Design an enzyme around this catalytic site. Structure first.
Site, PDB file in Angstrom:
ATOM      1  N   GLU A 130       8.232   0.454  11.770  1.00 19.85           N
ATOM      2  CA  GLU A 130       9.280   1.462  11.679  1.00 19.85           C
ATOM      3  C   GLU A 130       8.652   2.805  12.016  1.00 19.85           C
ATOM      4  O   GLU A 130       7.738   3.260  11.318  1.00 19.85           O
ATOM      5  CB  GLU A 130       9.914   1.482  10.286  1.00 19.85           C
ATOM      6  CG  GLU A 130      11.346   2.005  10.257  1.00 19.85           C
ATOM      7  CD  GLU A 130      11.435   3.506  10.461  1.00 19.85           C
ATOM      8  OE1 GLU A 130      10.478   4.218  10.091  1.00 19.85           O
ATOM      9  OE2 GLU A 130      12.463   3.973  10.991  1.00 19.85           O
TER      10      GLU A 130
ATOM     11  N   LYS B 106       0.854  -1.184   0.000  1.00 18.57           N
ATOM     12  CA  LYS B 106       0.000   0.000   0.000  1.00 18.57           C
ATOM     13  C   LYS B 106       0.890   1.235   0.000  1.00 18.57           C
ATOM     14  O   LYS B 106       1.518   1.542   1.032  1.00 18.57           O
ATOM     15  CB  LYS B 106      -0.929  -0.014   1.215  1.00 18.57           C
ATOM     16  CG  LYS B 106      -1.490   1.333   1.636  1.00 18.57           C
ATOM     17  CD  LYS B 106      -2.377   1.951   0.579  1.00 18.57           C
ATOM     18  CE  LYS B 106      -2.942   3.266   1.079  1.00 18.57           C
ATOM     19  NZ  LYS B 106      -1.873   4.149   1.623  1.00 18.57           N
TER      20      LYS B 106
ATOM     21  N   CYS C  24      13.268  10.036   9.376  1.00 20.92           N
ATOM     22  CA  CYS C  24      12.960   9.442  10.673  1.00 20.92           C
ATOM     23  C   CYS C  24      14.126   9.590  11.641  1.00 20.92           C
ATOM     24  O   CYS C  24      13.929   9.660  12.860  1.00 20.92           O
ATOM     25  CB  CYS C  24      12.594   7.969  10.494  1.00 20.92           C
ATOM     26  SG  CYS C  24      11.502   7.634   9.094  1.00 20.92           S
TER      27      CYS C  24
ATOM     28  N   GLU D 283       8.528  15.227  17.404  1.00 20.43           N
ATOM     29  CA  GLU D 283       9.227  15.130  16.129  1.00 20.43           C
ATOM     30  C   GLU D 283       8.661  16.151  15.150  1.00 20.43           C
ATOM     31  O   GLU D 283       7.496  16.059  14.749  1.00 20.43           O
ATOM     32  CB  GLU D 283       9.098  13.716  15.572  1.00 20.43           C
ATOM     33  CG  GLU D 283       9.937  13.453  14.340  1.00 20.43           C
ATOM     34  CD  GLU D 283       9.759  12.045  13.810  1.00 20.43           C
ATOM     35  OE1 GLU D 283       8.753  11.397  14.166  1.00 20.43           O
ATOM     36  OE2 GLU D 283      10.627  11.586  13.040  1.00 20.43           O
TER      37      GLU D 283
HETATM   38  N1  NAD Z   1       8.544   7.631   7.463  1.00 22.18           N
HETATM   39  C1  NAD Z   1       7.747   8.657   7.746  1.00 22.18           C
HETATM   40  O1  NAD Z   1       7.225   9.325   6.842  1.00 22.18           O
HETATM   41  C2  NAD Z   1       7.521   8.956   9.157  1.00 22.18           C
HETATM   42  C3  NAD Z   1       8.395   8.356  10.217  1.00 22.18           C
HETATM   43  C4  NAD Z   1       8.087   8.948  11.542  1.00 22.18           C
HETATM   44  C5  NAD Z   1       7.234   9.944  11.712  1.00 22.18           C
HETATM   45  N2  NAD Z   1       6.427  10.371  10.702  1.00 22.18           N
HETATM   46  C6  NAD Z   1       5.384  11.352  10.976  1.00 22.18           C
HETATM   47  O2  NAD Z   1       4.361  11.200  10.016  1.00 22.18           O
HETATM   48  C7  NAD Z   1       3.746  12.485   9.833  1.00 22.18           C
HETATM   49  C8  NAD Z   1       2.969  12.494   8.541  1.00 22.18           C
HETATM   50  O3  NAD Z   1       1.847  11.595   8.662  1.00 22.18           O
HETATM   51  P1  NAD Z   1       1.387  10.692   7.450  1.00 22.18           P
HETATM   52  O4  NAD Z   1       0.275   9.763   7.936  1.00 22.18           O
HETATM   53  O5  NAD Z   1       1.043  11.503   6.266  1.00 22.18           O
HETATM   54  O6  NAD Z   1       2.666   9.781   7.189  1.00 22.18           O
HETATM   55  P2  NAD Z   1       3.201   8.366   7.682  1.00 22.18           P
HETATM   56  O7  NAD Z   1       4.635   8.188   7.381  1.00 22.18           O
HETATM   57  O8  NAD Z   1       2.816   8.228   9.157  1.00 22.18           O
HETATM   58  O9  NAD Z   1       2.318   7.361   6.854  1.00 22.18           O
HETATM   59  C9  NAD Z   1       1.610   6.282   7.498  1.00 22.18           C
HETATM   60  C10 NAD Z   1       1.267   5.234   6.471  1.00 22.18           C
HETATM   61  O10 NAD Z   1       0.177   4.422   6.960  1.00 22.18           O
HETATM   62  C11 NAD Z   1      -1.001   4.674   6.213  1.00 22.18           C
HETATM   63  N3  NAD Z   1      -2.102   4.883   7.147  1.00 22.18           N
HETATM   64  C12 NAD Z   1      -2.669   6.081   7.500  1.00 22.18           C
HETATM   65  N4  NAD Z   1      -3.650   5.977   8.362  1.00 22.18           N
HETATM   66  C13 NAD Z   1      -3.735   4.611   8.596  1.00 22.18           C
HETATM   67  C14 NAD Z   1      -4.577   3.840   9.420  1.00 22.18           C
HETATM   68  N5  NAD Z   1      -5.538   4.355  10.194  1.00 22.18           N
HETATM   69  N6  NAD Z   1      -4.398   2.501   9.423  1.00 22.18           N
HETATM   70  C15 NAD Z   1      -3.442   1.979   8.652  1.00 22.18           C
HETATM   71  N7  NAD Z   1      -2.589   2.604   7.838  1.00 22.18           N
HETATM   72  C16 NAD Z   1      -2.787   3.926   7.853  1.00 22.18           C
HETATM   73  C17 NAD Z   1      -0.710   5.878   5.312  1.00 22.18           C
HETATM   74  O11 NAD Z   1      -1.409   5.751   4.080  1.00 22.18           O
HETATM   75  C18 NAD Z   1       0.802   5.766   5.119  1.00 22.18           C
HETATM   76  O12 NAD Z   1       1.143   4.866   4.073  1.00 22.18           O
HETATM   77  C19 NAD Z   1       4.911  13.466   9.899  1.00 22.18           C
HETATM   78  O13 NAD Z   1       4.480  14.746  10.346  1.00 22.18           O
HETATM   79  C20 NAD Z   1       5.872  12.807  10.903  1.00 22.18           C
HETATM   80  O14 NAD Z   1       5.803  13.425  12.183  1.00 22.18           O
HETATM   81  C21 NAD Z   1       6.593   9.890   9.448  1.00 22.18           C
END
Ligand code: NAD
Lengths: 493, 493, 493, 493
Positions: free
Chosen positions: C261, C185, C295, C392
């Protein structure tokens, strides 16, 4: 031969924290019963959230950087484990008698199988103590990279009642070998052997707070251990419903590491070319071992059609030779059921099997006025839709099912959400390898059954659990990998 | 299907040093012949002591600290090996045809078995390039200890003539993967394929001096390689006598590391319960593969008495279906022997077998006026005292021996000073496991034969050789362990 | 140097199931935007529960025993992965340009750091494909025991938006190498590169159903993947809250394996004896890499008191040299933020930092009317109670904190629930080892930062995730251990 | 603290074969002397070719398939080794006193360093006994392939006199752990401790013939062991000349496996930024430990120019604080040399050093009328051409050399044919890593010296030996790999 048992006097009935004996914060004590005679052995302090909290505090303090347990050499950890094993071997009689009395298990089996396995596992873990190693990695660029395998931290372990000592040892062997500290919760049915082992642990010379034991009730103490935020890992052995509850509780707090050892509906396949006597003996052993109170009990005995009748007949005869009596009595081969709840559950499942129309060969009813004894029971012509073919009976009840084609029996044996064990009986080599590859089970036995050793990793596949135990891969579960990368002036091959 | 072969033009006939082509210092060139038609292919520069010394100097300079090959990333080494393998796959037809002409081997086997094996081995070694790792050790005291696996240094490798390309790859795969530099000496019978591969190596992009090839005569060039003091390791594949000489010479000078791959009198046991057709086909394949010019060739076919006669009969018929002719000709399945010395040796051994009184079923004489062809031969009623049962014939001669009791045949098969291989044919799991455990052979095959792959280590027991090849254990041989221990302020688990 | 970017035409915008392109069951399509200019790129099919269910059906069918993917050789899986890597290297320009447009990332960084990392990781996994091995175990008794490492089954993987291609490759590398099948996904922000890679996967020659890609919205598609009963394992990269939800949902459904992660507040310690220029450069790189959308971004820069002022001044100067503009424009060093929500979140966090009383050295506001650009920002005198020191930020905001005592800074750096990374800068040998042992982080860098490679395992400690990726230990996570024990007639050492 | 020594009575002075005590075939007995007082301890039976032959017969019979030692469980082998270690710890005083008397070694060092090391190594090997494992290999085609690590066979081990008990344990630990049987030849100078340990081995409960000990003379008994054809492996610790002879003799007979542990001329580099007190203490320890009779003794002390003089001065003072006397006397820090031949060799080397023009700081002459004592000696301004800088003195003689450039000192330290050990003293991480990578030594110490433990492998690089000891890699040397490949109906991942 086993040495004659003596008088049992129980002195350790409290909560073991920081190498001390504490009363419960609430002050309540719950009794413990003898399955053979339905009598109170003694009272045991009842642990709850406050006791778990203070035990976790003690363990966390003992795990601090610079503490005596963290700076201690790995060889010294192995030496301490060996000393504990020697102390256990010194008290083999008392521990075996306590196991027999409290858990309603045969004294000969509680002596020649349980404590021998405990000692072997302890010594194996002590050997593994100072032999798990990190790595040095050929990373790209001018860098020197290595990986260390450190102890995870505080581990909370939840023990079942069927093998108190054996499961306790399997839980505190790999944990202490890797350097972790443990807060353990024994089953409310059988809490005594763990307390005696705790006293032995104090005697052996472990630093205070390394091992803590909180005896109590699962819904209160176990939940507190699983929902605690300062606990780094949780290992649990028991039923699948409580396993789901533990997994969800861990998901709701601290995102701790989770190891589950749940049950299973193990199939035991016997082919037309198998040795009939060995197959009969080991199938009877697989289903009827420890009154059928085993996670890996062979509950669905698939037997090929051409040899069905004969097998059944001999099986029936074997079930008649089983003798049912008091565990400490010499000559008995089956003791009582652990408690009234499982006794009534087994009776209900036998009655349901009768209602659904399965042929009853031997047994099918209770035995004795005092105690929890169920006659050895055999159910033939068991179809795939019967409840006795789906739900883990956890009692001395045997199901014998018929099949003709190998692919069909493979799909039948894999048509479940339990993947804990399987057994194949055949003289052919191609059949053995093919079936052992095809089956979805954590452990596949060929021409044997119930063969467990400290060396071979053990676990379940689909819903029988997560992770493995008793092996190098088992020791992998209790360590965390830290990668260190250093920028160097120049690297050379 | 194999692609049609084309005209062969040979350009690379010199000594390959520092990615350059040098004439020999003495100026002498020896011819190379075609076994099929007894014709000179071309003249090849004859290496000697001075040329070996020059190549060792070049390799030692290329192995210096800070050189391009030493600072190069391991992943880059794997990338270079993959590029070499792709270049080889590009020139599959020319290499296969050159192997067929020089070694007198079937074109279909040279294409579908030799080149494929070379490519697979090269790619396997390239994968292993950046995945061999040291360790971090829980040493006692406030110390941090780790171990690195470094390249040994200069490795001199001596190739046989039966599988020029395959053995060359098996030598320069693990050596270059671990970072070493090589000076190789190909067999005087078949030098051309190694020279073409050297040109490909130059094209691929290896740093100059990493790979050097000196074609010459074994007594002069091979001895110089083995007696050289700068050379750090010597790997040798060939006869046991030359291997003994190599080991003694290495013992005399520099105490270098020695790897020996020597022949053996491989047994092949067929039991009464074995599948007769598969057993016959694979025994025929095992003894008659590559005109019997294989180190692992099944030379003693033990067959149980109750199925002896039938087996022999079928074997005879199979040996009659063998077709003997020119290798490049389609439809042929056996080519000529490598050279006239081995041809006469095979004829002498066949005559001695006839003299000692072994029943002759098929063959027993030469074929064709032009070439080095020997008819496929079958010797029955072979006893343990016959020379054909003790000496590696290395030709298309098959011995069939009879036995009754399993223990006797085990003692017979272990009654030798060779331990290279064995083979068991049966349908029983217990017999298979017991015999495979009880045999003193480096590789044991059950219901198959001649199954070699890059992933499984290959070697011999007793006087069949020292060390292993083609695997993680094989890659262990080309590295040296350096232990670094650092005093730290304080250590924690 | 990076080749000039060209026109971009996007053809792949559907759901990739069974090597086919399907419209969504509902029929809805959501747009995707360009961060640099705030323009719609194209519409992508919106996946939901039905699409996930049919993709899981396809993957489960592809994973059946006897299917082409299950009987395929491991070396062939490695070969397929290498072919995929070569196909990716062929379309390096188009993939880099698509990554730059969709993710708002510098073209030079996309071409030289993302594509190179993807290719290296794919080739590393392809090498690992046919080299993971079970074991043979010296079990007690007349038994022969071995363990096989089989593919787990169906793995559902959830990708973030910051490194679409790199995370996608890190997911589908170890999964396909071990033989599993994947239903992935992609993030709703950046779904295009994954679809192009899916088309490349179809071209490479993977069997149908091995890889399936469902683009949609996380609360609907990701929840359906995490709660599906058939799915065996789930890997998720993202925020800690969604990871907690994933863990709970997995605890609710069939107890699937979970890899997480999650982010972290990574510290970066600079000591007085550290090289100032290298420390400044690598701290700026650590915090400001990829617009701070990493991250492992070094958010808390601990600097020793005696060198605080100078360091801060130099840091300020570096932050002034950063140039902000369109990613495809040459010479720019920082692109736009991924989307408006994160942009406003970053602005709010900067304003809260200003409100709580942290000294602002550079930046602190938006840049550019069109796009999502935030000026490089520096916050000095950050205390442990400020929100910018705990939450963060995931933006180009840098915090510089002061300390004097080593033990105190160790406790400060470990005073969090994040354990993803740490960095130490010093010239000493005792300090480096001491601090790297004392820090509770899954990766400790010394005199460098942001150094990640396919070989070294990567993961978090406390709440930054569970398990490891990119390495042998990482490949351990995608396999299940099956133990086979065979009763034999007699065993010998 | 060490316990007071008691009266010594020696009863074991014969040849130990088949858990029995035999007189020599010839009937000759050679005396053994006490270095401290030059007195005969007792007469020991003199082994020759016949005794070696019958010992090899006994060991070969004990190694037969189905024998008690071969069918014994690996855990039982570990248990036997642990029992042997416990028995040794019981007799720590008598063994320490016998070592002190026979080898002329300080009682405090014989008790706190030799016996402890022996016990730790035995327990480490006992732990490793049941944890070495084969593999299961993903071979191409429908095959199931695994590899077992079997005992090699009969191992003949030749012990030196500097560390009788420690070397004896290092030999018979890994050999017995892997399942082999041993025929051991102790040094003619110190044969008594090995005989007492043989009596302890008989008491522990090893099967007869597993361990055999033949005391005699090296030119006759050692040659017979190294030239025997029934012996499978030979391990030898001693001088390089005898090692060369052993290698050649093994190359002349049955091509047995050879392990060599030869001497070295170990450098010890001290840089300007090193801690002066720790460097002085550990350099003095490294050169003067066990009267300089160590293989890893730091003979060439390279000290950077800017700190040369000071270091020398302090070194001189340390050499004056050394006290020379009878080993059993408390307070003494140095005992006598092993025998008169080495005593005169040391005196000759000291005189040659004086003749060649090396500055003499302390010592340089004999001490005491009765005994073999040599004063602690310091030679400064030692150049690369002096004999004291090339030939292993093996006595309490210290050379101090000066350097200015790091590359030059690296080339100087690698300019030799010995590669046993090296030492680096510095406070910089970059220098430490660079030098530790650049040096060609089997063990590099940083800021310490003479740190050996059972966990870390030990061996030499160029001519200091072939192979490694004391570790998993060390245990690799005593096993042979057997590959079993089974044709199966169908394989699945
Ligand atoms: N690798 C990263 O991008 C990462 C690592 C740590 C922190 N973050 C945080 O993520 C924030 C951004 O949030 P985001 O959600 O757009 O990115 P995200 O990196 O948290 O993405 C989460 C993933 O899980 C999916 N998802 C979303 N809601 C879900 C649910 N209820 N159940 C299952 N899967 C779900 C999303 O489609 C996405 O693929 C940033 O502000 C940062 O603080 C991101």
């Amino acid at each position: 031969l086993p040495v004659l048992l003596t008088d049992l006097k129980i002195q350790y009935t409290k909560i073991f924290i920081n190498n001390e004996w504490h009363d419960s914060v609430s002050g309540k004590k719950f009794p413990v019963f003898n399955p053979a005679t339905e009598e109170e052995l003694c009272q045991v302090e009842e642990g709850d959230k406050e006791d778990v909290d203070k035990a976790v505090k003690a363990a966390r303090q003992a795990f601090q950087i610079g503490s005596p347990w963290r700076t201690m050499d790995a060889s010294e950890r192995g030496r301490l484990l060996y000393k504990l094993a020697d102390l256990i071997e010194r008290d083999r009689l008392l521990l075996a008698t306590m196991e027999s009395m409290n858990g309603g298990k045969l004294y000969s089996n509680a002596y020649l199988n349980d404590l021998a396995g405990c000692i072997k596992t302890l010594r194996y873990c002590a050997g593994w103590a100072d032999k798990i190693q990190g790595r040095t990695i050929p990373i790209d660029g001018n860098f020197f990279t290595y990986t260390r395998h450190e102890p995870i931290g505080v581990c909370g372990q939840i023990i079942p009642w069927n093998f108190p000592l054996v499961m306790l040892i399997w839980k505190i062997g790999p944990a202490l070998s890797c350097g972790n500290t443990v807060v353990v919760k024994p089953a409310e049915q059988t809490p005594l052997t763990a307390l005696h082992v705790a006293s032995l642990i104090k005697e052996a010379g472990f630093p205070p707070g390394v091992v803590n034991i909180v005896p109590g009730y699962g819904p209160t103490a176990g939940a507190a251990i699983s929902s605690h935020m300062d606990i780094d890992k949780v290992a649990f052995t028991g039923s699948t419903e409580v396993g789901k509850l533990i997994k969800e509780a861990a998901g709701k707090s601290n995102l701790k590491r989770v190891t589950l050892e749940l049950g299973g509906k193990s199939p035991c396949i016997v082919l037309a070319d198998a040795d009939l006597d060995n197959a009969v003996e080991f199938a009877h052993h697989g289903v009827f071992y420890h009154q059928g109170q085993c996670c890996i009990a062979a509950s669905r005995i698939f037997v090929e059609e051409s040899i069905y009748d004969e097998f059944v007949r001999r099986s029936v005869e074997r079930a008649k030779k089983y003798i049912l009596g008091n565990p400490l009595t010499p000559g008995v081969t089956q003791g009582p059921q652990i408690d009234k709840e499982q006794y009534d559950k087994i009776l209900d499942l036998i009655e349901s099997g009768k209602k659904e129309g399965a042929k009853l060969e031997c047994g099918g009813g209770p035995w004795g006025n005092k105690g929890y004894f169920v006659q050895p029971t055999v159910f033939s012509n068991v179809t795939d839709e019967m409840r006795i073919a789906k739900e883990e009976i956890f009692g001395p009840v045997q199901q014998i099912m018929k099949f003709k084609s190998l692919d069909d029996v493979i799909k039948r044996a894999n048509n479940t959400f339990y993947g804990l064990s399987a057994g194949v009986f055949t003289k052919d080599i191609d059949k053995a390898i093919t079936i052992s590859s095809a089956l979805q089970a954590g452990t596949v036995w060929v021409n044997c059954y119930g063969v467990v050793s400290a060396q071979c990793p053990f676990g379940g596949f689909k819903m029988s659990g997560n992770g493995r135990e008793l092996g190098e891969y088992g020791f992998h579960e209790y360590t965390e990998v830290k990668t260190v990368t250093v920028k160097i002036s120049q690297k050379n091959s």
